[PDB]
């Protein structure tokens, strides 16, 4: 499974001007998902990692998914 | 949770020239994930749905994630 640095998750979430709660709602994983991901205590779903990588490069795509 | 038609999943997977096995590896969900999704017998992760919607519009983004 592709892995991801917790710091990368924080970076992209903040670039998108999302709260942890909002990110968890949009990307899935349950209410406290991003809180755990950003502490390195859970692994996001592979699709969450890949979607975050896409959004890091093309943040305007948030308007297509939110 | 946003829902998705099984036919949409098939459409995007085939547009991307992926097998069910390849899609399951790239997007996650386990080996038989797409087999189940395309029969309507499991719900993809929210990030999988959103990433498929992005790829339907911008299929070239497969090169950023594969």
User: Distance between CA atoms of A63 and A29, rounded to whole angstroms?
Assistant: 20
Q: In a 10 Å sphere around its CB, with 0-12 CB exposed, 13-18 middle and 19+ buried, how is residue A3 labelled?
A: exposed
Q: In a 10 Å sphere around its CB, with 0-12 CB exposed, 13-18 middle and 19+ buried, how is residue B52 labelled?
A: buried
Domain that holds residue A56: 1-66
State whether residue B47 sits within 8 Å of chain A by CB. yes
State whether residue A9 sits within 8 Å of chain B by CB. no
Inter-chain residue contact B45 with A50, CB threshold 8 Å: no
Q: How many CB atoms neighbour CB B45 within 10 A?
A: 23
Inter-chain residue contact A46 with B26, CB threshold 8 Å: yes
- Total of domains in chain B: 1
Which method was it determined by? X-ray
Resolution in A: 1.4
User: Distance between CA atoms of B24 and B14, rounded to whole angstroms?
Assistant: 13
Q: Which of residues 10-39 of A touch B (CB under 8 A)?
A: 26-29
The DSSP symbol for A34 reads H
Nearest to B9 by CA among B56, B58, B59, B64: B56
What is the secondary structure of B1-66 as a DSSP string? Answer: -----HHHHHHHHHHTT--HHHHHHHH-S-TTHHHHHHTTSSPPPHHHHHHHHHHHH-GGGHHHH-
Tokens at residue B3, please?
């829902």
Residue A28 sits in a domain of what CATH number?
1.10.260.40
């Amino acid at each position: 499974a592709e892995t991801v640095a917790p710091e990368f998750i924080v970076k992209v979430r903040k670039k998108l001007s999302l709260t942890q709660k909002e990110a968890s709602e949009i990307f899935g994983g349950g209410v406290n998902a991003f809180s755990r991901y950003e502490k390195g205590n859970a692994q996001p779903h592979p699709s969450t990692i890949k979607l975050l990588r896409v959004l890091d490069k093309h943040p305007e795509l948030l308007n297509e998914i939110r």
